[PDB]
Amino acid sequence: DYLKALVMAFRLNEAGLITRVYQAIPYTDIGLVVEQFPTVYVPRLLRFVAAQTEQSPHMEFCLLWIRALIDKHGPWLAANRGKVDVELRVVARAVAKMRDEIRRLADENVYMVDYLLNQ
Amino acid sequence: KKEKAAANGASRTFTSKLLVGGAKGDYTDFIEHLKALPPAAADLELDEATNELLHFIRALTSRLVARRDYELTQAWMTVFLRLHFDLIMENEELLQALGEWREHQARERDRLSELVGYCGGVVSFLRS
Amino acid sequence: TLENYIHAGAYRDAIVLALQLNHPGRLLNLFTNVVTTRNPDPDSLTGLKAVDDVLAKLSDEQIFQLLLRLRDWNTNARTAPVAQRVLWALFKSHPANKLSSLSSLNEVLDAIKVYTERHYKRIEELVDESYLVEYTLR
Amino acid sequence: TKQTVETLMAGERIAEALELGMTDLNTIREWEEARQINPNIAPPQRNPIFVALGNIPAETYVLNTLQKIKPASLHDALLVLPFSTIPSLLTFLNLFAQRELNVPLTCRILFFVLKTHHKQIVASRTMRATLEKVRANLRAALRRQKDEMGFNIAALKVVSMQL
């Protein structure tokens, strides 16, 4: 269903359209979608959800996208490598920037809270 | 951009709307107020269950239970506890308030850190 | 309560003697043995309440001596963790004010802080890697 | 050439250590189940090597022979094992987690294992169960030792601010 639309939106290469249908799908369906998704468009898709992670405040959503992605298409990425090693390398960067920004601040705060909560 | 000014704050009728939030349930107006001014060092550094700190902490707690603005929540919370940590260790109400904040803060931290953790890790593995 | 002095004063006298000793010290080994006791009952800072207790009664110059050795136990990965746990029991049983005061503190405190941060980075990275299990499984 | 002498040596040491340890664990749990029938009269008769060492738990004999191998050879040595040894290893790894015995080491070796034995482990339901055990315990261990240093570093920052 949504899948169909997303494969067409990639089939057209129209970036804005890809984005509309991308944010369109509900978070509960992402599994289903990524599972049935064409492998040839998987590297391209990665480049996308990478660039979305680092240019639009939708953390849980994008991280979920990468999550279900590596989950359903991991062995593939492994064996293939090649050009995908660039795609991979921007995903890593993408989660890294996401990591050290949302972790560094969070736990620090809560640790201080903890000490204060203990006197 | 906004995430450049956010990293700028941590290097360095307002109280009206924030206190009106106590009457209301949505400190939303106040959140926008804060989202405005760049020298929050001047503003943040500023009786009986109607002193500003309890309600500010309550406002960050409110934002946490949303699904947005984790970034500025933490950013504001660290500069809050950068200078107010000696003054709030003296009072009791804002202690129970931080005790409530820590709840939501914890749940969500767990969620997000498992996600960026799982992803960061598995991807670091796959590129090997 | 003379019996109580007798039973409780045992480990107190033991540890205090260890700290007096500027020898390499089985102090490490006493702590080590008592913090990983196969029976952790009851549930508290060291598992043996008695250890928290003797930690609390601590002589202050000896608290300092304990930190001075703690910073040394933080250099090795092996001895590190037990150091982290006694540091933890120490900081949790004592409010900061008693500890801010002295009886040369800051340099030791900074060696401690630095190396603790290092092991923090290390362990975080290890959680990230550890999710490998999560994937492999499912 | 020589690398395989090293590898092989370091393979045999862990393999037989794991044999002794696993047999020991099995005898003691047998004795457990046997004593829960009748608590009176029931001797362990453990292998002489443990009682020779100062009567130590299997876990630590295993852990020590492990901790003893050269960092570099640890890889190929892990790989060279027969698969027959593997489940025991997980059974000990679980234990290393359950008591937080040398976490970074038990990790490093656990990754080396998983990286090379995916399918084999995920096959047999027994190995997956022990793997769920190590998952839980190692996760709990890392959690606790993390939060500890966090609180430690909070208090350190607060006394450094206080000074």
Tokens of D14: 């862990």
Q: Residue holding tokens 């989202």?
A: B35
CB D138 within 8 A of CB D103: yes
Contacts of D145 in chain C (CB under 8 A): 81, 84, 123
Query: Which of these, B82, B91, C110, C51, lies nearest to A119 by C-alpha position?
Result: B91
CB A115 within 8 A of CB D158: yes
Please give the structure tokens belonging to residue D62. 């295993």
H or E stretch at C124: helix C105-137
Residue-wise DSSP of D44-104:
----HHHHHHTS--HHHHHHHHHHHS-TTHHHHHHHHS-GGGHHHHHHHHHHHHHTTTTHH
Chain A residue closest in CA terms to C96: A119
Contact A62, A52 (CB under 8 A): yes
What is the least distance, in Å, from the CA of A14 to any CA of chain B?
Answer: 26
Taking one residue from A and the other from B, the number of pairs with CB-CB distance under 8 angstroms is 99
DSSP C45: S
Distance CA D58, CA A10 (A): 58
- Residues B113, B116, B122, B125, CA torsion sign: negative
Written as six digits, the tokens of D143 are 């959690």
Burial D6-42 (b: 16+ CB within 10 A, else e): ebeebbeebbebbebbbebbeeeeeeeeeeeeeeeee
* Subunit contact D146:C120, Cβ cutoff 8 A: yes
Q: Which residue has the tokens 């995920």?
A: D122
Instruction: Count the neighbouring beta carbons within 10 Å of the beta carbon of residue C46.
Output: 21
H helix intervals, chain B: 2-9, 14-23, 28-36, 40-44, 52-64, 70-83, 93-126
- Please answer yes or no on whether C131 and B118 come within 8 Å at the CB atom: yes
Answer whether C106 touches D (CB < 8 Å). Answer: yes
Query: What is the C-alpha separation between A48 and D154, in angstroms, rounded?
Result: 39
Buried b vs exposed e over D88-112: b needs ≥16 C-beta within 10 Å? bbbbbbbbbbbbbbbbbbbbbbbbb
Q: Which residue has the tokens 């994008």?
A: A62
3-state DSSP assignment of residue C95: coil
Q: Is A26 helix (H, G, I), strand (E, B) or coil?
A: coil
Cβ contact, residue pair D157, A107, below 8 Å: no
Distance CA(B35)–CA(C133), nearest Å, equals 41
Q: How many CB atoms lie within 10 A of CB A101?
A: 19
Give chain A's radius of gyration (CA, Å): 17
d(CA D150, CA D128): 32
Cβ–Cβ under 8 Å, residues D150 and C120: yes
Of D2, D150, D29, D14, the closest CA to residue D80 belongs to D14
The number of domains in chain D is 1
DSSP string, D112-153: HHHHHHHHHHHHSHHHHHHHHHHHHHHHHHHHHHHHHHHHHH
* Structural domain count, chain B: 1
What's the gap in Å between the CA of A118 and the closest CA on chain C?
A: 7
Give the method used: X-ray
Q: Biggest alpha carbon distance in chain B?
A: 60
N- to C-terminal Cα distance for chain C? 59
The half-sphere exposure of A80 on its side-chain side, counting CA atoms within 13 A, is 15
Q: φ, ψ for residue C37 (rounded to 5)?
A: -55, 120
Q: Say which residues have a Cβ less than 8 Å from residue D99's Cβ, sequence separation at least 6.
A: C36, C38, D59
Q: Spell out the residues 6+ positions from residue B98 whose beta carbon is closer than 8 angstroms to its own.
A: A113, A116, A117, B57, B88
Q: Which two tokens stand for residue D64?
A: 């020590």
Q: Where does residue A4 rank: exposed (0-12), middle (13-18), buried (19+ CB within 10 A)?
A: exposed
Q: What value does the CA radius of gyration of chain B take, rounded to a whole number of Å?
A: 17
Cβ contact D23:D61 at 8 Å: no
Name the packing angle between helices C2-20 and C27-35 (round to 10°).
130
* Other residues' Cβ atoms within 10 Å of the Cβ of residue C121: 10
CA distance C74 to C65: 14
Q: Is B95 on the interface with A (CB under 8 A)?
A: yes
Q: Which two tokens stand for residue C116?
A: 């603790």
Sketch the domain layout of chain A as residue ranges: 1-119
In the numeric block, the tokens 């607060």 are attached to D158
Q: 3-state DSSP call for residue B37?
A: coil
Cβ–Cβ below 8 Å for A111 and D153: yes
C100 touches chain D (CB under 8 A): yes
> How far is the CA of D91 from the CAs of D28, D33, D59, D98, in angstroms?
14, 19, 10, 11
Resolution value (Å, 1 decimal): 3.5
Distance CA A43, CA C127 (A): 27
CA angle B48, B49, B51 (to 5 degrees): 85
Q: Is A40 helix (H, G, I), strand (E, B) or coil?
A: coil
Backbone dihedral region of B68: left (phi > 0), alpha (psi from -120 to 50 degrees) or beta?
beta
Structure tokens belonging to residue D130: 């022990």
D131 vs C contacts (CB less than 8 Å)? 133, 136-137
Backbone breaks in chain C (C–N > 2.5 Å) follow which residues? 103
Q: Is the Cβ–Cβ distance between C58 and C72 less than 8 Å?
A: no
Q: Do C92 and A74 touch (CB under 8 A)?
A: no
